[PDB]
Amino acid sequence: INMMEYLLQGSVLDHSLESLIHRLRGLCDNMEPETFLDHEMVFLLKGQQASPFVLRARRSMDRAGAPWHLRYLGQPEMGDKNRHALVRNCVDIATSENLTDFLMEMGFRMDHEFVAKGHLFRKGIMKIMVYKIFRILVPGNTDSTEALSLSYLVELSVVAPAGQDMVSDDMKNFAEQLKPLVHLEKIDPKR
């Protein structure tokens, strides 16, 4: 079958992050944080059609023995079923450790890279992730990193099969539980 992803996004200043972490520890499940660290690449294939194909590939620099991960995300749906979150079509694949060579030989070209570092939380079927984006220059090395801004980014995500109503409502309630600190909205990828 096909799956769908519902998304909500926001940001927080980094001089008040401890209070947000304490609140998320108090609200989420009784599980210790993970502190992930991932490298990310974006591949683009430009054919005859105007819109090029785009794929994302991730890798874990912290835990050895974790397979690579592909991801493809389609255009957001304009249908008026759920109107409080980004609803998109997602396909995710676990792949062996020669992904770049095969993707290059199909015809894809790399576009840009970044490194993300942050924390991860689970609540029911909801995924909270709070991370900071870095910048990679001199693309051969992965130690030439500088911070991009003065704020962390916060994501609320739920992945579920098609249909499956009364999910955005629970996401709205959980977002409103965090209103005095972070303000999460539906925002379009365009500007």
Binding site: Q9, G10, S11, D111, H112, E113, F114, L148, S151, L153
Partner: peptide
Amino acid sequence: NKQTFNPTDTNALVAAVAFGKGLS
């Protein structure tokens, strides 16, 4: 009465993680 976020950051980060504006 102290502010604790900054919507222009939100705009920068979202428009830079949803496509590479500011990373190339």
